[PDB]
Design a binder for this molecule. Structure first.
Ligand SMILES: CCCCCCC[C@H](OCC(=O)O)c1ccc(Cl)cc1
Ligand SMILES: CCCCCCC[C@H](OCC(=O)O)c1ccc(Cl)cc1
Lengths: 265, 11
């Protein structure tokens, strides 16, 4: 009834406010930069090797390693930063910090990359990706051009992003969507699934009401977002497969200890 | 030895 609905809107707002606190660059700010509607300094565009060299100081997060490997390493540190932000966000979801601590770890271990790819879409258009909190823009063609197989990592994320961004979700919608994904009761090795699904069920009701109110003309948007959750799991599976290739092909790659924990399978 | 657990426990 209306009392439940009001509580769902208060939960949606709490999540939005926590999302704003956790993530430095929101979708609204990212899209303004991408569409060129900001007053702030323009991102440095990296579209070829010359511009990467020039722009390197603008986009920094010494270097004799080959460029594809250097981009690979830099990406880990950005990914590790994202894990930290997502963990802060998860701790703001009501009920999360009261879960068994090993289950909180499990939820982050198996959920964080699905969230990374969701939030990465906010930074992407069909032509490239905003990097370094808006200070750079690396073209999709440049990343595709990196020597095999490094040029294969980002393209499926761009493919996901263009379709995902066509749904026109805003930061308020995204805050609930990512909370739903974190609270997935089917992650391997969860010790107590029922409290997780109880939280998720309430988040799913908050998401459905959010979409009905914020996107009244977008038919079955909720069903579309449930399908995107499945699509994100496929992106993760494919990314892991590519990592296995690099591990078998490339000689001495240093994997960050936080990613070592996450990818310990 | 869990880095995720350390992140979760920091207020
Ligand atoms: C395996 C996926 C490729 C690596 C991901 C890059 C991380 C990206 O960072 C942009 C930057 O800092 O340039 C990002 C994404 C989501 C959040 Cl929530 C925060 C940051
Ligand atoms: C080539 C241009 C795109 C980089 C591709 C994403 C990189 C990937 O992402 C980090 C993550 O899965 O969290 C990763 C994994 C392990 C190492 Cl050692 C380095 C990078």
């Amino acid at each position: 009834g209306s009392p439940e609905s009001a509580d769902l809107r208060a939960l949606a707002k709490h999540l939005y406010d926590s999302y704003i606190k956790s993530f430095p660059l929101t979708k609204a700010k990212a899209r303004a930069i991408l569409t060129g509607k900001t007053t702030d300094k323009s991102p440095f565009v990296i579209y070829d090797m010359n511009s990467l060299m020039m722009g390197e100081d603008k986009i920094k997060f010494e270097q004799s390693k080959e460029v594809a490997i250097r981009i690979f390493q830099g990406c880990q540190f950005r990914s590790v930063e994202a894990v930290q932000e997502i963990t802060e966000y998860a701790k703001s979801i009501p009920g999360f910090v009261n879960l068994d601590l090993n289950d909180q770890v499990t939820l982050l271990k198996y959920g964080v990359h699905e969230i990374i790819y969701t939030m990465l879409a906010s930074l992407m258009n069909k032509d490239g990706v905003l990097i370094s909190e808006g200070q750079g823009f690396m073209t999709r063609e440049f990343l595709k051009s990196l020597r095999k197989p490094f040029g294969d990592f980002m393209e499926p994320k761009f493919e996901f992003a263009v379709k995902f961004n066509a749904l026109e979700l805003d930061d308020s919608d995204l805050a609930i969507f990512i909370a739903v994904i974190i609270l997935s009761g089917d992650r391997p090795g969860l010790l107590n699934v029922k409290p997780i699904e109880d939280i998720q069920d309430n988040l799913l009701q908050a998401l459905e009401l959010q979409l009905k109110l914020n996107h009244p003309e977008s038919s079955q948007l909720f069903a579309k977002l449930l399908q995107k959750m499945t699509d994100l799991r496929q992106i993760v599976t494919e990314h892991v497969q590519l990592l296995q290739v690099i591990k078998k092909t490339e000689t001495d790659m240093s994997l960050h200890p936080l990613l070592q924990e996450i990818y310990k399978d | 030895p869990s880095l995720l657990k350390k992140l979760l426990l920091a207020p």
